[PDB]
Amino acid sequence: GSSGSSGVMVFISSSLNSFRSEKRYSRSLTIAEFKCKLELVVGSPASCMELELYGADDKFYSKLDQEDALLGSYPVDDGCRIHVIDHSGSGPSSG
């Protein structure tokens, strides 16, 4: 245990995965860092994969390009959807 335990529930997705996943991340997690996480979610490189902030009825809003930004400054919230765009691809190689 340690001081610090809170974040925002977002629905992470990926063209690789059929349905969306249920993960959590602090609003202080820099976009750059945030991806570092997805790296384990999509299993792909965060330096390749892209993030997307979709509204409710899957309605893209903005892109999480800003790496020096903190997860929150954007029009997101615990319940939004984070569609991870697998830029890596993968298929024959690796797998």
From Swiss-Prot:
Widely expressed with highest levels in brain. Broadly distributed throughout the neonate brain but restricted mainly to ependymary cells in the adult brain where it is concentrated in the cilia. Supercomplex made of cofactors A to E. Cofactors A and D function by capturing and stabilizing tubulin in a quasi-native conformation. Cofactor E binds to the cofactor D-tubulin complex; interaction with cofactor C then causes the release of tubulin polypeptides that are committed to the native state. Cofactors B and E can form a heterodimer which binds to alpha-tubulin and enhances their ability to dissociate tubulin heterodimers. Interacts with GAN. Interacts with DCTN1. It comes from the Eukaryota. Coiled coil: none annotated. The modification Phosphoserine is found at S62. Phosphorylation by PAK1 is required for normal function. Ubiquitinated in the presence of GAN which targets it for degradation by the proteasome. Belongs to the TBCB family. Binds to alpha-tubulin folding intermediates after their interaction with cytosolic chaperonin in the pathway leading from newly synthesized tubulin to properly folded heterodimer. Involved in regulation of tubulin heterodimer dissociation. May function as a negative regulator of axonal growth. This is Tubulin-folding cofactor B. Signal peptide: none annotated. It comes from Mus musculus. Disruption phenotype: Mice display significantly longer axons than wild-type mice. Overexpression of Tbcb causes microtubule depolymerization, growth cone retraction and axonal damage followed by neuronal degeneration. It is found in: Cytoplasm; Cytoplasm, Cytoskeleton.
